[PDB]
């Protein structure tokens, strides 16, 4: 008889203890294709991005301060890398008679790009 424990608590009562107009799907999407293509501002909210860099650089060297311009350089570079990769993916999709990027479409692009 297989058994498993899920309460994960040796005792109960742990708390009591001492310790309308609507557009068709895609029209708004193309409108803000135009919006984010005519625009130049930076699309990954900064703070969250900076943090991504702190928790990931931590591995290579502790106590590594980053000049502000640097995390802005990492953002720009990351958004440029991903917009280039996403142009390629859309192509890797429009190739297969489709209009929806899918994970496979990007595991391939990166193989032809040779980034893998």
């Amino acid at each position: 008889a297989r058994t498993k424990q899920t309460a994960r608590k040796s005792t109960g009562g742990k708390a009591p203890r001492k310790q309308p107009h609507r557009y068709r799907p895609g029209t708004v999407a193309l409108r803000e294709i135009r919006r984010y293509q005519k625009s130049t501002e930076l699309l990954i909210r900064k703070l969250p991005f900076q943090r991504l860099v702190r928790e990931i650089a931590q591995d290579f060297k502790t106590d590594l301060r980053f000049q502000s311009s640097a995390v802005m350089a990492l953002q720009e570079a990351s958004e440029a890398y991903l917009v280039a990769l996403f142009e390629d993916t859309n192509l890797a999709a429009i190739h297969a008679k489709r209009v929806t990027i899918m994970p496979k479409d990007i595991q391939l692009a990166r193989r032809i790009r040779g980034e893998r």
Partner: peptide, 19 residues
């Protein structure tokens, strides 16, 4: 094989289960 669930099928509450 299939993994059982994390809740009782009778009372819908967590605890030690017989699978």
């Amino acid at each position: 094989d299939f993994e059982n669930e994390d809740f009782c099928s009778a009372c819908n509450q967590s605890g030690s289960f017989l699978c």
